[PDB]
Amino acid sequence: TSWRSEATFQFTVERFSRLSESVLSPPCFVRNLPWKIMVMPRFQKSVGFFLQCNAESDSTSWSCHAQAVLKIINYRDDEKSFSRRISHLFFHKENDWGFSNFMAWSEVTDPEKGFIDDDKVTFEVFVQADAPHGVAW
Amino acid sequence: ASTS
DSSP states (O other), rough: OOOOSSEEEEEESSGGGOOOSSOOOEEEEETTTEEEEEEEEEEOOOEEEEEEOOOOOOSSSSSSEEEEEEEEOSSOOOOOEEEEEEEEEEETOOOOOEEEEEEEHHHHTOOOTSSSSTEEEEEEEEEEEOOOOOOOO | OOOO
């Protein structure tokens, strides 16, 4: 159910080499909160990869601590997938967390590295969140 | 790590 304490979800960004603005994935519910993958180019240069939580809510009383593994899937060999871990207390003023320079843009778009295919790159997040506060009273 |  949506109350699950953890989950793994993916989002495939199409026309990746042409990405010019931030893109958001549909939500994956964990602890009954919407979590989304946010990807954005940073300075071509680097791939920005962030995990967002409950950004749509107008509430300013919620908080949720979570740990996650952000990974860019290598379609040729999963062992070559690149990942970084995060731990963060999400709340209205800090509702997303990740890396502005997760990977070099040149590396992810290199047709010989195995991260891109048909100009598509897949991002994956494994999130483990604690019970949130200020949500379900 | 940081916010976007």
